[PDB]
Amino acid sequence: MVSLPRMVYPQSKVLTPCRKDVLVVTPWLAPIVWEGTFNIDILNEQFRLQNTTIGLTVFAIKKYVAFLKLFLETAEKHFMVGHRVHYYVFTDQPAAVPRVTLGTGRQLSVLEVCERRFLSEVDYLVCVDVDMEFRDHVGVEILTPLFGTLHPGFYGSSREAFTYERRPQSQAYIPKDEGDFYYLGRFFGGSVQEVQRLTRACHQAMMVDQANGIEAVWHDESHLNKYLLRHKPTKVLSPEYLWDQQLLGWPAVLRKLRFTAVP
Ligand SMILES: CCCCCCO[C@@H]1O[C@H](CO)[C@H](O)[C@H](O)[C@H]1O[C@@H]1O[C@@H](C)[C@@H](O)[C@@H](O)[C@@H]1O
Ligand SMILES: O=c1ccn([C@@H]2O[C@H](COP(=O)(O)OP(=O)(O)O)[C@@H](O)[C@H]2O)c(=O)[nH]1
Ligand SMILES: [Hg+2]
Ligand SMILES: [Hg+2]
Ligand SMILES: [Hg+2]
Ligand SMILES: [Hg+2]
Numbered sequence: 001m002v003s004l005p006r007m008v009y010p011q012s013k014v015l016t017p018c019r020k021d022v023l024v025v026t027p028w029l030a031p032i033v034w035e036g037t038f039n040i041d042i043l044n045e046q047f048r049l050q051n052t053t054i055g056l057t058v059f060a061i062k063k064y065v066a067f068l069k070l071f072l073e074t075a076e077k078h079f080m081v082g083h084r085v086h087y088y089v090f091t092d093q094p095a096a097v098p099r100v101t102l103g104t105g106r107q108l109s110v111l112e113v114c115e116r117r118f119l120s121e122v123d124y125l126v127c128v129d130v131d132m133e134f135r136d137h138v139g140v141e142i143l144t145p146l147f148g149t150l151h152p153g154f155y156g157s158s159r160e161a162f163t164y165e166r167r168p169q170s171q172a173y174i175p176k177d178e179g180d181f182y183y184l185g186r187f188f189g190g191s192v193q194e195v196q197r198l199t200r201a202c203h204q205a206m207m208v209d210q211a212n213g214i215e216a217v218w219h220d221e222s223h224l225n226k227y228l229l230r231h232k233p234t235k236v237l238s239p240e241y242l243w244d245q246q247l248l249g250w251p252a253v254l255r256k257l258r259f260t261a262v263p
Contacts, residue, residue, distance in 0.1 A: 185221030
């Protein structure tokens with residue numbers, strides 16, 4: 001709505017690709033977020049003017065509560081810094097949640113293990129796994145109605161090699177000649193509405209597979225991929241946003257490693 005203020009930055013070169021080594025836009029015109037493709041100053045202005053609030057959801061059950069401290073501490077240094085953030089930690093051990101110091105405008109809720117609550121408190125929802133840590137900037141450049149993240153182990157793979165559910169009996173089934181990318185189940189999100197639609201669809205699909213006595217090869221991730229195949233994401237995040245340096249190193253194609261597995 002509101003107009004952006006005067007800003008000074010490099011023009012942008014119509015005749016110069018921002019990247020010559022990677023695909024920066026999908027066939028359905030959704031941007032693929034790589035370092036160098038965005039001016040964070042412009043994006044920060046756009047989202048702050050909207051007083052955007054981002055919700056970050058994580059599940060920490062059983063032995064996984066041990067990952068919370070590093071997860072939250074690093075998020076405080078790299079996730080949506082400058083914007084309103086609301087952390088939602090779902091755990092079976094509320095008292096085991098570390099007391100992490102948060103910056104201003106950021107809050108955390110412990111939910112022991114509602115839907116409409118999200119719609120009321122945040123504009124976007126970012127759903128990630130807790131056994132990770134932020135190592136670099138993860139900001140508003142990822143926000144959009146719906147986004148998936150390229151899985152680090154298959155970004156350069158052909159569709160036939162993707163570990164999609166290949167059994168026709170499963171609702172998550174995807175044949176060999178179908179598929180755009182293999183998205184990681186550990187990092188996805190979008191507007192509250194779109195995220196609830198995705199989780200709702202996947203919940204029902206999994207219920208169907210259950211009754212039929214079948215369980216997708218990679219569970220939630222398998223259904224996520226089926227959903228995103230049929231409902232194209234409005235933005236796709238590159239592997240910079242979901243990596244594992246111990247297992248994959250640090251390729252030249254990745255100018256930054258932002259969110260990674262904890263060794
Ligand atoms: C062909 C080489 C690929 C190496 C990565 C395999 O990653 C696993 O992929 C499956 C789907 O095929 C699941 O997504 C699984 O969760 C992935 O493992 C997890 O992510 C990788 C990157 C690594 O951090 C593992 O320790 C995780 O368990
Ligand atoms: O067999 C499993 C593996 C993971 N999880 C849950 O998934 C979350 C994060 O998943 P994972 O360990 O697969 O994360 P990744 O290494 O993919 O980041 C954990 O907090 C657990 O609550 C689970 O319930 N069962
Ligand atoms: Hg979520
Ligand atoms: Hg689904
Ligand atoms: Hg599900
Ligand atoms: Hg899903």
